[PDB]
Design a protein around this ligand. Structure first.
Ligand SMILES: O=c1nc[nH]c2c1ncn2[C@H]1C[C@H](O)[C@@H](COP(=O)(O)OP(=O)(O)OP(=O)(O)O)O1
Ligand SMILES: O=c1nc[nH]c2c1ncn2[C@H]1C[C@H](O)[C@@H](COP(=O)(O)OP(=O)(O)OP(=O)(O)O)O1
Ligand SMILES: [Mg+2]
Ligand SMILES: [Mg+2]
Lengths: 264, 184, 264, 264, 264, 264, 184
């Protein structure tokens, strides 16, 4: 918590943003996406949750509907509705006013870049290797790690998408695997549930253990409000410490956590 | 055309530069003294020496070789005239080869050229006679002992007009004809 | 299923055995193993279930207890107690008397080898690479794919062992990846839930699509008594067909399915 | 080489055939192929041999001519000319009358298959993954590892082809990587110069060291007539022993070596 | 050449340095190292020249001598003798005074760092992942890609070390594989003969081919004083253009090439 | 014959060469190709005749054998055996010594190019559009219209390849469709049975009909020894006249026909 | 010891076999006719020829070279006596070199041996005189013209006792001393 601010003021902290940050905007949740896919396929949700977890439910929608295109179209329209205002969001304001040179996200929505451009901060948005060619060292790198709504082929949603990302041969995978070399990652709004991220940090811990400088690895941090000792032990094996809060509100806890980063 | 030359003789560089003067091509000569092989075939002897020069340079490079062929000695030298001249010089040349029954001998220049793709062989010859007495300046090897056929002056004594009838000339005229005719 | 039996008389079908075949005998279930892990770590079962799926729960047991050794001793004594008789198991009798040259299993218990040694079938047990050197072509290959109770370092139970199997550098992974080239796999008692098997068959499907010969890929089959159209579509993408039965009892359904293979 | 016969009667020896066996036959050598490519591209041979090794010379032919189709056509006609008789070849006769269940080769010619069909022995020729599906256990497997003249895309001749084989994702690569698990390889006519074979046996050695069972690894053998202590030490690190002969004739040395396998 | 200067003034060019830069100083050549290994093992060099090439010679020295330690001690004392002065080296002066943010090198000597510290330019030397943690964006990154003389386990000299570097699981390999994404590489003094660099740029070209963006790949350049059309075509397939000079002297050619980069 | 020679000496006659020119050399016939296809597919030839005609049989060989590659390899070896001599062929000599500026052929063998280079005549061989780029106006054009053995994808043998060539979108089809505009085509050894050439000349007859210039169309000629009035009337509708002979020998009739063309 | 030999001369094989007969070592001689280079240093001339023979064989192989050194010709041959003899032969040898002021000449044999690890050079020499008339059998090159010092019979005429005082002998005695002394 104090060493995190020490590395943050040094400029050696990468921000990783999950869906829990975008949960405070009034966006549809993951379960509402499951309900929409279930009603689109002729099911009803609870009769579609006894069959597969989630990758099975995006994979089955892709297989029955051909492509991910109608799903991407619906997600593009409801994730960027006109009712959502980025100025009434203290979490996105604290993200924009804080100093993070590299920002990663698994969200396909553009509210991080909207908050960055709304509060007068320049950025470089990376979703392809041609955007890796445009990286400015004096601007924020916003890497859409799991895709964007500007490309159906980039969205990491279904089982085959995660199976493609497991080999770590994407340009974004290579860029992330070298960005975690010698830099701390701060996970906010993210539960570390995606299999490719856990395999990436497992291979990073194995890489630091193979060189026999396991004490010298930069220490990562994850902010979850509800505590979990199981995840705590498993993530502390990968040098990812847990920062918890006693506040029951997740958005308030994230605001009080990012308050330390917006200031100076 | 910018063609390189590897040799040991320094006066060979000045002869090739004076012969090819004003042509359009230029020669970037270098001194390395590539050893040859003891073979009778002069095509293989120019081929491996051009191979060693191309291994040395890697750019378009030509290689010259000049051989005397004594008819009294059953055509002995040619490919290995250097060691011959470097060992017995002019003093032990004319007293045992110029005074025999057959003073006739023929001098040949063979040029091996590499255009960085292929190997091109050009040759020229003049016939002549060995002098009984060395005559003229002694700064270019067997020039002071070589009487050409139809003349009474050695190639050293005749001066700058040696580079109009000499075999190297004929060989470099065929080389010049190839170099301005194109890479055919 | 005439094409499956036509591949079966030619000897081109590999039997893959899951946990339902062993669960027919009266062995402890996976839920009872999670309960034993929970009361061994001081939890009651259900609160421990609302913390992680199963790989995180077994990983938490291995991290709190140091090794997998107390757990391995408990499943060794419970899965091989004297109350279980292999002679009162029609499924294991039909497995033993069938002509399956290669048998893979993700069970750690030795009831397949006990079943084949009961009914006079000679076999070769494979759990290491020296046992791959001990292979006879006229004997049944029994491959303990997820480990055995003899070696604690070979048991694939928690998340880290599944990551090491996801890299596919094990000898057994290499042997399986070449055994699936040009042979059919018949899954009985298995749900195809382990991510290394799913990545293996995804890479096999990508392999046959790369050579532009996906029409000529051998057809795999999974016998599930309870139907699942989501998995049917997802496994049909990997050339794994589904065989379902109308019987509500999984044991009698598996008996009636293996009746087609035991005879002649 | 008594242990080689001891593994030979059990059927645990894989034959690997290189280019020296297809030389006795009077086929064009490798340097004649270099001369043909050099004269095809407008060079003369040695002036093409002070530019690159061999992979650069097949890569440059494939880049100037588009494909390796003219090269495959010339190699197909001159490697199978009507002047070559397989009956006047004692090495191919000793290969055919021996009992090798699995035969690997890096030749693109079909003289191993012609020698075995000439001497009445049935075989299964493997060059794609459908031929892996056609494998009989009571027949000889002849695997064309580096390609055949039937397929232009299978020939491993230039540098890009060797890079694709260095990835080890071909079906033939997976089949070889599990065939070397627990079997000895006998290299005849082969210098072990191809980098994908050296990386394959290096990874096999690393695999046997990771199980801490490297004393139990099956010992491979290479037959080279001229001795080389450098290769002897380097291949001895990969469990590949050298068998040398004092005869200066390579074909006669190979005949006296394979006479020990042709009998009984 | 003009696009190289345009990318260099933008700051998107990585300098790659080989042994041809360091041979201007009077350091021992590769053949003198071959000679030292040969007379250390009791050979004379020309009889050790018929056996292997360079990897077999450092592998055989490592296997007979136990480790690379005597050789590294000899290369450490010979490559850093007091007769070599960096101030009479125009090439190292032009490297030091140019604005290259990232410098890679396959040299083990410290003459790049000595030249950078002579002419008052701050730098970060990277040879471990803990040095990747020390990267400042206002300082030059010097990466000792093939090792340094401070660590025997990092020197990539023999065949086994190149076989470890072929898998690209080293942290320096990961950092280079992401640094080539969207940046140009300028090779000076280097012939692109190491197999891991060629496999890296082949995989980079394949990576830009899978994203269907081959025209948007940054272009790399190699300065070779002696022309080679075979390499030119082969490196042009990997978007590495060739820059040649008509000067026969390589040091003065490299001086005239780096004169375009030192000024302003 | 009179107007044919009159258009020859102006240089306005294209030579089209079929299989019957090449049958003089001792080449395998079409029937022997069908016999080899039937033998390779396990049929005897006479039953295999009773199923398709030629295109369906070559289609069946392609579909059962995967590609056309084994058939192309066999056709390449038997069509270019060492027993075939181009100097003892008066037909190929009379073709080579004649000044035909454009030569088309449906043969995949290189005997026209071998006869052209053997009798000291320069040529440009066209089998792709990159060879259309190298057309010199003082050299003869040999166009391999139905493919060559240097490319599997170019051979027009089975019904799918004829169906691709029916659309006239290959570069060679556009080149032929403009070369027949305002030039005469002389057919030797060819029966005009391929569907693409009949459709091409039907469209050419439609083109000269639609411009109201039916009288001004150049006259094509076809030399068959056996007189067919049906082909005479049908080809006369496409302005392709017939030249017939009374000699029963087709090779001697072809030599007597080409005797008017070799002279001066 | 099983040591191989690469040469072109066939009678050299029989001389080396008769000299090394009964020693314990055996020679597996082969005929390849390796070309030499045109250099004055016989150490480099035996080193590159042994390099070419080791590239040909790859087993332990020795290489012999034999050179005449005419004192009247300022020590001209030696390394290149072959082309000399294959040209002038015996007819154009004694009439211009045996009748001069200094008939003295020295014949040297140099042996280059490779033990598959290093290169070992052994040499031996005898002095002698050129005959004015060729004398004896003419089946082994310059044996019929070489009078050794202190004798009046040529090496061809003296018979089988030439292999007790000859230079090749001395060189092979040092070679035999090394080969039975060990690989030192
Ligand atoms: O116009 C000439 N007039 C008189 N003598 C000449 C001439 N041209 C060559 N010579 C003599 C000098 C050379 O020593 C010897 C060998 O001829 P040659 O092999 O071609 O020259 P080289 O060996 O001395 O130098 P390089 O290494 O380039 O081959 O013939
Ligand atoms: O005992 C000898 N008595 C008379 N003549 C001899 C003798 N030994 C060598 N000779 C002559 C023959 C050889 O043609 C010439 C060059 O000597 P030398 O180079 O060592 O033999 P070589 O060139 O003919 O055959 P090789 O390829 O093995 O070197 O001197
Ligand atoms: Mg010379
Ligand atoms: Mg010789």
């Amino acid at each position: 918590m104090e060493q995190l601010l020490a590395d943050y003021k040094k400029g050696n902290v990468i921000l990783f943003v999950g869906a829990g940050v975008s949960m405070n905007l009034g966006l549809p949740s993951w379960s509402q996406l499951v309900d929409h896919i279930a009603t689109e396929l002729g099911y009803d949700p609870d009769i579609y949750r006894t069959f597969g977890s989630a990758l099975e439910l995006a994979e089955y929608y892709k297989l029955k509907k051909g492509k991910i295109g109608p799903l991407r179209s619906w997600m593009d329209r409801m994730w960027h509705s006109s009712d959502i205002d980025i100025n009434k969001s203290k979490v996105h304001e604290y993200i924009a006013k804080a100093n993070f040179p590299i920002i990663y996200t698994t969200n396909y929505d553009r509210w991080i870049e909207t908050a960055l451009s709304n509060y007068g901060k320049e950025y470089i948005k990376i979703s392809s290797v041609s955007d890796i060619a445009k990286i400015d060292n004096n601007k924020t790198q916003i890497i859409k790690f799991h895709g964007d709504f500007d490309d159906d082929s980039s969205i990491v949603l279904d089982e085959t998408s995660y199976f493609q990302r497991l080999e770590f041969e994407t340009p974004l995978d290579i860029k992330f695997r070298s960005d975690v070399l010698g830099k701390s990652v701060l996970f906010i709004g993210y539960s570390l549930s995606d299999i490719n991220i856990r395999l990436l940090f497992y291979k990073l811990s194995k890489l630091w253990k193979e060189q026999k400088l396991e004490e010298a690895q930069p220490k990562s941090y994850i902010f979850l409000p509800r505590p979990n000792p199981i995840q705590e032990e498993i993530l502390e094996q990968w040098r990812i410490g847990m920062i918890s809060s006693e506040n029951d509100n997740p958005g308030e806890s994230l605001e009080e956590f990012l308050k330390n980063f917006v200031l100076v | 055309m910018n063609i390189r030359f590897i040799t040991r003789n320094r006066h060979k560089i000045k002869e090739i530069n004076k012969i090819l003067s004003g042509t359009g091509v230029v020669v970037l000569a270098s001194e390395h003294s590539i050893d040859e092989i003891q073979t009778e075939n002069v095509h293989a002897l120019i081929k491996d020496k051009l191979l060693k020069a191309f291994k040395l340079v890697g750019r378009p490079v030509f290689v010259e070789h000049t051989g005397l062929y004594i008819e009294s000695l059953n055509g002995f030298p040619g490919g290995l005239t250097q060691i011959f001249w470097d060992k017995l010089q002019a003093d032990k040349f004319s007293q045992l080869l110029g005074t025999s029954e057959n003073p006739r001998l023929v001098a040949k220049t063979i040029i091996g050229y590499c255009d960085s793709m292929k190997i091109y062989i050009f040759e020229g010859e003049t016939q002549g006679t060995i002098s009984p007495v060395p005559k003229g300046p002694r700064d270019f090897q067997w020039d002071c002992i070589f009487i050409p056929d139809g003349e009474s002056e050695t190639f050293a004594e005749m001066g700058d007009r040696k580079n109009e009838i000499s075999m190297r000339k004929k060989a470099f005229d065929k080389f010049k004809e190839y170099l301005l005719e194109g890479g055919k």
